[PDB]
């Protein structure tokens, strides 16, 4: 028992909530604490929100894609878009109504965070959480 889920949806802000709910529902099969579930929901929200407002510039035709692989109590969360991309990844991870906390929150709540991006290709954020 290794369970996996993949979700794709329109780049609309109302789907931020939908993504939090869905990933949490799937991670629930592991019986995580409320705090762990809150953390998962939050990092999903950060990544999905980034794809929508930064990747697709709020264009609802863009498609946000998510993958959750659960194997051996380990959660592999991947959020991706085929948006405009990030010129300098390193600079962007550094803390208009922008809080600049997105990546920092992801990095703090998760045990591993890998960001891949290429201008006019898209962005993929791989997050990993250990210990259910």
């Amino acid at each position: 028992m290794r369970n996996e889920m993949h979700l794709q949806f329109s780049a609309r802000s109302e789907n931020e909530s939908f993504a939090r709910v869905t990933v949490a529902a799937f991670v629930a099969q592991l019986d995580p604490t409320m705090d762990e579930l809150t953390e998962i929901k939050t990092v999903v929200s950060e990544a999905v929100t980034n794809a929508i407002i930064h990747g697709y510039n709020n264009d609802p035709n863009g498609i946000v894609s998510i993958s959750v692989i659960i194997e051996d109590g380990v959660v592999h969360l991947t959020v991706r878009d085929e948006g405009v991309g990030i010129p300098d990844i390193e600079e962007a991870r550094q803390p208009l109504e922008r809080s600049g906390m997105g990546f920092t929150i992801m990095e703090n709540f998760m045990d591993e965070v890998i960001v891949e991006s290429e201008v006019n290709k898209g962005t993929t954020v791989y997050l990993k959480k250990h210990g259910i």
Partner: protein, 115 residues
Amino acid sequence: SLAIDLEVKQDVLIVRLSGELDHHTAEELREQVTDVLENRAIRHIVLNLGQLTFMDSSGLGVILGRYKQIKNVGGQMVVCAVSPAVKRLFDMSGLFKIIRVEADEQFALQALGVA
């Protein structure tokens, strides 16, 4: 998903939130609050987060956008009845250093001398 209940007491704007605060719901909050700050002599803002069940960095952005406004009039930003989760975002981001956190709306109002 996000109910907003506002109230003014002297030069303090009390913002009471219920529900979830993210990029999707933050816009209506920003508009409503900035409207009040424009047509009223507000120097302080008390953000009541007791009924808020969720918040991400977008919630921090809308708060921070207000902080800049309040700092311009020499006022103070106070957040109260903060959940441990939200408290975690304030520590991690250092916002706990520039924004005061109080137990509830009453103590927050007292700290501002309007109660």
